[PDB]
Design a protein around this ligand. Sequence first.
Ligand SMILES: [Mn+2]
Ligand SMILES: [Mn+2]
Ligand SMILES: [Mn+2]
Ligand SMILES: [Mn+2]
Ligand SMILES: [Mn+2]
Ligand SMILES: [Mn+2]
Lengths: 356, 356
Amino acid sequence: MEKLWLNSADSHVLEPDDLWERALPAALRDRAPRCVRDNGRETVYVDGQVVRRDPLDFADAMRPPGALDHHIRLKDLDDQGIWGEVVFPSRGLWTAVMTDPVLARECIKVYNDWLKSDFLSLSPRLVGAAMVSMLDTDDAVAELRRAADLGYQTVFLAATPPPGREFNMDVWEPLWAAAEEAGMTVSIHIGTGADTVVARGPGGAVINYVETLFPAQRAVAQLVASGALDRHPGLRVLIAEAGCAWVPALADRMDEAYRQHGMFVRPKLSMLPGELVRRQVYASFQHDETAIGAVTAMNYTNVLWGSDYPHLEGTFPRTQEVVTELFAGVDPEVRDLITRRNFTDLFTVPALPATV
Amino acid sequence: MEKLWLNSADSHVLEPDDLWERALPAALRDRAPRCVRDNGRETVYVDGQVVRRDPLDFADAMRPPGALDHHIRLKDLDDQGIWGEVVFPSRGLWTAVMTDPVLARECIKVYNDWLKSDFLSLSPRLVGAAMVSMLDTDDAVAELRRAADLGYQTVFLAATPPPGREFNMDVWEPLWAAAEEAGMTVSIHIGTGADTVVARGPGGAVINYVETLFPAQRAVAQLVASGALDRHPGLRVLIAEAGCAWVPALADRMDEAYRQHGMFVRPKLSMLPGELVRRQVYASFQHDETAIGAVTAMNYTNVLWGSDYPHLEGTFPRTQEVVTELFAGVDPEVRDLITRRNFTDLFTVPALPATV
Ligand SMILES: [Mn+2]
Ligand SMILES: [Mn+2]
Ligand SMILES: [Mn+2]
Ligand SMILES: [Mn+2]
Ligand SMILES: [Mn+2]
Ligand SMILES: [Mn+2]
């Protein structure tokens, strides 16, 4: 009943409630992410601001026992037929909306040290994303370098960077250089860095779920148009949890501007935007049938599957039912590429016997 | 040497410099859109505001003579192998950033009367888009009904509506009802309405070309999630000049929200977002190879080819060479659907005589 073995390019780890309470310098402790559970309500506070209010029902729906207990997580991976799994933050993501570079740097060190010592230590099937400062390039380079010396394979960046720190700016060049030198995949996860509760009228739930795409597409356009990827041929970028089929559409959109608006284009690129996307830009999805069409009809081979465990928008606990229906009638080479091989190009886990 | 007849879902016409100056009363006639090309840049004035100040390339971005002489435009249709062509405004599109509903209403009436009298009269191969007020629903419904009586087949709406008039709001319901009643296609052309985001740094030309997609994806999300299309099964929407392959990607994104976030979704729809997209949402492209894979691999059949004459991002004067490369080794049934049949499902032109 779990016959199709998968690697998951997207999932999340819930941090211990006291992670920052115990480990931060006393001056910083009270400003770290912290939650109050009262009335029906969880309220999350970050550095003197309420950043989140939810009824406990929804909050706790994304908190099955594996989302917390790493021993149960590994058993859920077996149960769902997932071998290797990339693990992103939950509360740690709020470091991306902080305005104080020192609070962000120190909260990121704590998170990165806990994830490696207390979680990535349980199984080599776990590939964690180290956070790096969104606010200061020297802080982000130093932590990437420390995280890599510790055996991290990828860094997390928020899809919406702080104002004036868009991904086409010169300020990021030292980070691209260090990531390329380290062999570090840059993982950009959507729904991070900002607020995505922008739509309030009829259809808000569906409209807001679409709005979170825009920073993902913008990030790809900035990395491609700025020459960041062109200048760093070894630099690979994963766009996590934005789906896949918009990526070749965007490759075509950029090619059209590059070719028809060339007289306004700076910098020039050594190859077309679409060639950079197809070489270096990867994208994950959970349910999207269109991800298979991207590979088979749009020559976009950089599609990875993800469970996004334990989010509502992920596959858990119906991983096998989802993927078996997704890949019914599909070339096994394509199913292998999307569910296993793109994962192992990016990330190192112990190799299974590759059944076709 | 050899050509294939095509129909085009997108092009523009350049209005007489004095169109509004000569036709509007004294209270309005100085505040209508005015374009100056002088000293290497294009300046546009609307109601006392500089809305555009864009560089021109006096050497390498030179406008086709047929943009300036409608007799040369008709020679260019024959030369390019284009039978039927939808024609959008140019200076007229600036009515969408007006804040005065009287000026907008009156400027729209002048445009719609001029287009019919002096331009569409040149050939019934031209399918005009009538403008309707973005500011006032009564004004929009009135003009749509007047345009329908005049024989108009489609109305233009700007991709970014005025703040508080997003496409998911109740304020539009009367126009959705009127368009469906009249059998009028709603044509949402990108790059129109107030300019949401503008990139200033490296890669700006490519980034800004991508940024214009986001209002189009948003509009589709608002129309699908709000029930606008669900409540009006006879209402068809054309997204002009945004490309195609993001449309099935967005169908999948919206289905995932509808199915996994069902508890937060209001209103309920009578079918899934992706079924509404595949039934009622059409999209045009000029060069995008991915638009063919949207049809062949993503079950998205509502793709239309457009020339976007006489813009830089259009195909002129290489229309036949572009379509030849696009459709090399493609099923001719798919070429017919994309280049002729979808166009004749939405629009009525005279019979294309047959060859052989
Ligand atoms: Mn995720
Ligand atoms: Mn789910
Ligand atoms: Mn002059
Ligand atoms: Mn156009
Ligand atoms: Mn255009
Ligand atoms: Mn061109």
